[PDB]
Amino acid sequence: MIGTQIVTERLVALLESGTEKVLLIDSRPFVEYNTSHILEAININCSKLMKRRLQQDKVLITELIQHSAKHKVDIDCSQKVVVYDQSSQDVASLSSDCFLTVLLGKLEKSFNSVHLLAGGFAEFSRCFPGLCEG
Amino acid sequence: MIGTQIVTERLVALLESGTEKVLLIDSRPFVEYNTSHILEAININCSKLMKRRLQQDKVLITELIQHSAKHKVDIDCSQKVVVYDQSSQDVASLSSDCFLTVLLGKLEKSFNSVHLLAGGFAEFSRCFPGLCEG
Amino acid sequence: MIGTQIVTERLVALLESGTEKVLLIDSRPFVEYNTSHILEAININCSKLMKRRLQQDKVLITELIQHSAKHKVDIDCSQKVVVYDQSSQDVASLSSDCFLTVLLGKLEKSFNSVHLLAGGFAEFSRCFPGLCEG
Amino acid sequence: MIGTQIVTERLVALLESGTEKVLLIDSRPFVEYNTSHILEAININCSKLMKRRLQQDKVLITELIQHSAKHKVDIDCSQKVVVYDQSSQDVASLSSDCFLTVLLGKLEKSFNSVHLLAGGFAEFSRCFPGLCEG
């Protein structure tokens, strides 16, 4: 896993353009997600069990994404994928074995461009409240 | 689905010099596969029942690829993927609603480089019988 | 250089439905190009002198592509690239040290998807004479 | 231009792995570069003139990279490219028309993975002094 980031302003620049198709993933607990999240973000359960099954490779990230979608999600390895939790500043500040870290590895294998959101939902919701759904 | 081909000879070249990881997909009936197939190739049942599940996006291709593997098949979008049937010369000569075309469409979505083997397992086993497996 | 092909028919399909940007490269002598070439195709002189400059990496392919364009050719690595000569059936039938093979090698380095047109400008102009340009 | 970042720790993780080939680009003035820079970083002159020629598309970024290399540089669109200046924190904190911003656009077009180093040479040299050359 390489691990790269995108900042809020640049994500919004990305969303506002008909340039790229974005897969937005919210890796927080569902109460948080259901409470508020970035528009059209897909909730991927931050479970300790799900982490085990992903690293056991008994679940595929592409499988989890689609099962987690209320919509019928488009899986396409050309989609720019942005992941976020509550307040992680960068990939380096993560522990080697946590869920988000595991999630990024699986994603970087199935998608060409995978980025963590700098500051997480905390910063994003702080800057663009009109872009969050409750 | 765009549809590109690789000729039998460039496949071997692609294999011999391990500069790229190759995912080899045998899309023929199980009996044809189990008889003889290109070394290390993965069999994806030519089931019209599996077809209908793919077009329904009720099963993902990478899911279907890992299910059809004895070893731990590494789903990685930067893998070069080569599909083969019995004796298809190229992608244009395929019907609009056949398993292969359905298979290639879903594969090109999950994988960067996806190629049909020009001539199928007919010409390959006709040229490199030592690279086949009983 | 791996070496993959696209058949005349899938090229047109690739063009008609603008879901991908296509870079069309005519690798024949200038007189052959100027007579008739596939619509919008860029001519890259088959010069043994240009060959030697490419293998010396004294001229870059994207440099050579923009030099050989009347319009502003957008060098973009995510462009689908299709090369053609007069009547080459596939990449395997090419000599190890010919311009085409040298051209494809450098192109695959600068571009994600690079394909030889199966049958060259012979079969294409034999099938879509309306998509040729005098 | 999308614009993404990589932090020092993750760049070093990237360099230390035989996983990916990295193109390291130093976009500062040459006195700074010659004074000290990250090992094997290629100096790309931060010139106001060069900025104009790049945006006029009269110079190609792939052309500039190779001309700027004391070594014979490998241009290959699969190379992970990390760019850095003195102390830019993220892409969003850049002005829309500055050189670095122009540089990132051109690079993102010729390379699949292009990232700005979070904090620039200032932070990198602050953390890994043994990885800088004077």
Side-chain angles (χ1 to χ4, degrees), chain A residues 1-47 49-66 68-69 74-134, chain B residues 1-18 20-47 49-51 53-65 67-69 74-96 98-134, chain C residues 1-18 20-47 49-51 53-65 67-69 74-96 98-134, chain D residues 1-47 49-66 68-69 74-134:
Chain A
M1 184 259 280
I2 305 181
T4 52
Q5 296 98 43
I6 185 167
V7 307
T8 298
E9 285 188 33
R10 298 314 295 157
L11 172 57
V12 174
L14 181 61
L15 286 167
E16 258 184 333
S17 80
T19 300
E20 301 277 350
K21 162 55 195 171
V22 184
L23 179 61
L24 211 52
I25 292 167
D26 186 334
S27 66
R28 303 169 309 164
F30 70 104
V31 189
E32 297 187 50
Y33 170 73
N34 292 336
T35 284
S36 187
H37 54 268
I38 309 175
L39 53 65
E40 284 186 318
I42 292 185
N43 194 204
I44 279 199
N45 194 34
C46 192
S47 186
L49 263 66
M50 190 62 62
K51 183 182 72 172
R52 166 65 63 95
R53 303 169 66 202
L54 280 165
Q55 49 194 180
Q56 283 309 318
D57 286 328
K58 292 309 168 188
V59 178
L60 293 191
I61 195 51
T62 45
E63 184 182 351
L64 194 51
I65 283 166
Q66 186 83 242
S68 301
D74 167 37
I75 65 158
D76 172 15
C77 71
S78 60
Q79 275 176 120
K80 311 295 177 179
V81 186
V82 179
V83 194
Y84 71 91
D85 60 356
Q86 187 52 32
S87 63
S88 295
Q89 296 306 323
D90 52 56
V91 178
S93 65
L94 297 178
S95 99
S96 37
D97 198 58
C98 72
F99 176 77
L100 178 47
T101 284
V102 167
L103 186 68
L104 287 163
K106 295 308 157 177
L107 281 170
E108 269 195 19
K109 280 219 187 77
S110 284
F111 300 91
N112 295 320
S113 267
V114 177
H115 306 286
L116 179 64
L117 186 68
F121 183 75
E123 177 162 347
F124 185 88
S125 61
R126 182 175 57 92
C127 302
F128 301 96
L131 298 179
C132 310
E133 303 173 346
Chain B
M1 189 264 284
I2 300 167
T4 56
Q5 293 97 41
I6 189 172
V7 297
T8 293
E9 210 170 337
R10 297 306 316 200
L11 175 65
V12 182
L14 170 67
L15 293 166
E16 287 198 316
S17 58
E20 293 275 4
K21 173 52 188 176
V22 188
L23 177 54
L24 216 40
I25 295 173
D26 184 337
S27 80
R28 303 173 302 157
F30 82 96
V31 197
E32 294 197 47
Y33 174 80
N34 286 330
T35 286
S36 178
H37 59 261
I38 302 181
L39 194 70
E40 267 203 335
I42 285 191
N43 188 221
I44 294 190
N45 198 23
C46 191
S47 175
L49 188 153
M50 190 50 59
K51 179 171 77 175
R53 299 178 61 188
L54 288 169
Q55 24 202 190
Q56 286 316 308
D57 286 342
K58 283 298 184 182
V59 53
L60 299 186
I61 190 45
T62 49
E63 185 177 357
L64 170 54
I65 285 169
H67 264 285
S68 307
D74 164 69
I75 57 155
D76 178 357
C77 74
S78 74
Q79 275 186 118
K80 308 296 185 174
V81 181
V82 177
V83 210
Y84 74 94
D85 59 0
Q86 190 49 32
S87 65
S88 273
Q89 294 301 315
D90 49 56
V91 165
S93 68
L94 298 179
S95 74
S96 313
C98 62
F99 185 68
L100 203 51
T101 290
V102 144
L103 181 59
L104 287 167
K106 301 279 174 281
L107 276 172
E108 276 183 9
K109 283 204 172 66
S110 283
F111 293 95
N112 295 321
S113 264
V114 189
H115 306 286
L116 190 71
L117 181 56
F121 181 84
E123 181 176 328
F124 188 96
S125 69
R126 182 177 62 92
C127 301
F128 301 82
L131 296 177
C132 293
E133 190 181 347
Chain C
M1 189 264 284
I2 300 167
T4 56
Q5 293 97 41
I6 189 172
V7 297
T8 293
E9 210 170 337
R10 297 306 316 200
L11 175 65
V12 182
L14 170 67
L15 293 166
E16 287 198 316
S17 58
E20 293 275 4
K21 173 52 188 176
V22 188
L23 177 54
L24 216 40
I25 295 173
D26 184 337
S27 80
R28 303 173 302 157
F30 82 96
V31 197
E32 294 197 47
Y33 174 80
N34 286 330
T35 286
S36 178
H37 59 261
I38 302 181
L39 194 70
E40 267 203 335
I42 285 191
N43 188 221
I44 294 190
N45 198 23
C46 191
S47 175
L49 188 153
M50 190 50 59
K51 179 171 77 175
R53 299 178 61 188
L54 288 169
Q55 24 202 190
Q56 286 316 308
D57 286 342
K58 283 298 184 182
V59 53
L60 299 186
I61 190 45
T62 49
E63 185 177 357
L64 170 54
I65 285 169
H67 264 285
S68 307
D74 164 69
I75 57 155
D76 178 357
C77 74
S78 74
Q79 275 186 118
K80 308 296 185 174
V81 181
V82 177
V83 210
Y84 74 94
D85 59 0
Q86 190 49 32
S87 65
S88 273
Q89 294 301 315
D90 49 56
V91 165
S93 68
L94 298 179
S95 74
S96 313
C98 62
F99 185 68
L100 203 51
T101 290
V102 144
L103 181 59
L104 287 167
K106 301 279 174 281
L107 276 172
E108 276 183 9
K109 283 204 172 66
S110 283
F111 293 95
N112 295 321
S113 264
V114 189
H115 306 286
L116 190 71
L117 181 56
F121 181 84
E123 181 176 328
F124 188 96
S125 69
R126 182 177 62 92
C127 301
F128 301 82
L131 296 177
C132 293
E133 190 181 347
Chain D
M1 184 259 280
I2 305 181
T4 52
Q5 296 98 43
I6 185 167
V7 307
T8 298
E9 285 188 33
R10 298 314 295 157
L11 172 57
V12 174
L14 181 61
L15 286 167
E16 258 184 333
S17 80
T19 300
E20 301 277 350
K21 162 55 195 171
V22 184
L23 179 61
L24 211 52
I25 292 167
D26 186 334
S27 66
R28 303 169 309 164
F30 70 104
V31 189
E32 297 187 50
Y33 170 73
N34 292 336
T35 284
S36 187
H37 54 268
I38 309 175
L39 53 65
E40 284 186 318
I42 292 185
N43 194 204
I44 279 199
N45 194 34
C46 192
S47 186
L49 263 66
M50 190 62 62
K51 183 182 72 172
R52 166 65 63 95
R53 303 169 66 202
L54 280 165
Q55 49 194 180
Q56 283 309 318
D57 286 328
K58 292 309 168 188
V59 178
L60 293 191
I61 195 51
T62 45
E63 184 182 351
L64 194 51
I65 283 166
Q66 186 83 242
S68 301
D74 167 37
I75 65 158
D76 172 15
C77 71
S78 60
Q79 275 176 120
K80 311 295 177 179
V81 186
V82 179
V83 194
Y84 71 91
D85 60 356
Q86 187 52 32
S87 63
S88 295
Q89 296 306 323
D90 52 56
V91 178
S93 65
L94 297 178
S95 99
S96 37
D97 198 58
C98 72
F99 176 77
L100 178 47
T101 284
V102 167
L103 186 68
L104 287 163
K106 295 308 157 177
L107 281 170
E108 269 195 19
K109 280 219 187 77
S110 284
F111 300 91
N112 295 320
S113 267
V114 177
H115 306 286
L116 179 64
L117 186 68
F121 183 75
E123 177 162 347
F124 185 88
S125 61
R126 182 175 57 92
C127 302
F128 301 96
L131 298 179
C132 310
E133 303 173 346

